[PDB]
């Protein structure tokens, strides 16, 4: 690929924590330690609006499949469901006993899954805002949570070194994945086709697992990741790549099949904590920490 810097989005007053493109490709949502969520035009990077309400820093924000809602996870121990068009906070999800770190809607956007420093994973009803189930999932902070293609499964990752797959309906632990070493698992998500799980560990490594067989199929290395929970993505609009931020302030792009690094994006002045891939165009959004505070849009 040939990703080139097109726009730089300035606005957050503290480290950016996550960036996500809306499923309809129109917008980019960002969360920050500054307690705010900001919306930007996906193609022109034009600032759209700011959504406020959280009392402390935000670690994650995610879109509902129809692009109408957002859910955010904050250190104020709550998650908030927002109506993007009006900016309204529809519900504040209370239940976690410690910082909420990660969140996602299921495919039908009728449920939300969250991970917390309280070591649990919670499943919430979107319409009522009530917690339906609490899973005693891990023995250390939960770094990521994601639903599979049909929402029947949830994958979670934790500093305890484990990746676990849960049955959404029963809450039973169906599988625990871990390799020959036990470094903290800082991020995890299912692949677009739902067959695999991409997991990041704080030993500078990304791995693609066939969770059904419980085997590691690919390993991606070359970047730096030993301290922060950096997101990773499957880029599918053009070539099939793996994308991730790095602690050396660069965005890394690997060939998913060959595992070779195909490009490194330079420009940020601090750790690239989050990256997102546009659903239809070859566009990548990247966000950096405290010494940088900006979001960058790259196009190939």
């Amino acid at each position: 690929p040939n990703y080139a810097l097109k726009f730089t989005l300035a606005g957050h007053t503290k480290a950016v924590s996550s960036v996500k493109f809306s499923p309809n490709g129109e917008w980019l949502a960002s969360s920050s330690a500054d307690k705010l969520i900001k919306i930007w035009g996906a193609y022109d990077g034009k600032f759209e609006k700011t959504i406020s309400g959280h009392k402390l820093g935000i670690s994650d924000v995610a879109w509902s499949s129809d692009s109408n809602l957002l859910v955010s996870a904050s250190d104020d121990k709550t998650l908030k469901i927002w109506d993007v068009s009006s900016g309204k906070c529809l519900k504040t999800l209370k239940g976690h006993s410690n910082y909420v770190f990660c969140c996602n809607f299921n495919p039908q956007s009728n449920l939300i899954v969250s991970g917390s420093f309280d070591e649990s994973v919670r499943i919430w009803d979107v319409k009522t805002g009530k917690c339906l189930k609490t899973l005693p999932a891990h023995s250390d902070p939960v770094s990521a949570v994601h639903f599979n293609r049909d929402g029947s499964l949830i994958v979670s990752s934790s500093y305890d070194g484990l990746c676990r797959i849960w049955d959404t309906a029963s809450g039973q632990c169906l599988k625990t994945l871990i390799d020959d070493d036990n470094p903290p698992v800082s991020f995890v998500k299912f692949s677009p086709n739902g067959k695999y799980i991409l997991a990041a560990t704080l030993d500078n490594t990304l791995k693609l697992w066939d969770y059904s067989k419980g085997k590691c199929l690919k390993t991606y290395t070359g970047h730096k990741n030993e301290k922060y929970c950096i997101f990773a993505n499957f880029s599918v609009t053009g070539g099939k790549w793996i994308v991730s931020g790095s602690e050396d302030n660069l965005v890394y792009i690997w060939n998913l099949q060959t595992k070779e690094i195909v490009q490194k994006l330079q420009g940020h002045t601090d750790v690239v904590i989050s990256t997102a891939c546009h659903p239809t165009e070859n566009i990548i959004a990247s966000a950096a920490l405290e010494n940088d505070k900006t979001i960058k849009l790259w196009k190939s």
Binding site: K14, S32, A33, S59, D60, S74, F101, K227, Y228, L289
Partner: peptide, 6 residues
């Protein structure tokens, strides 16, 4: 939050 090391 995510911006801080655990």
């Amino acid at each position: 939050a995510r911006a801080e090391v655990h």
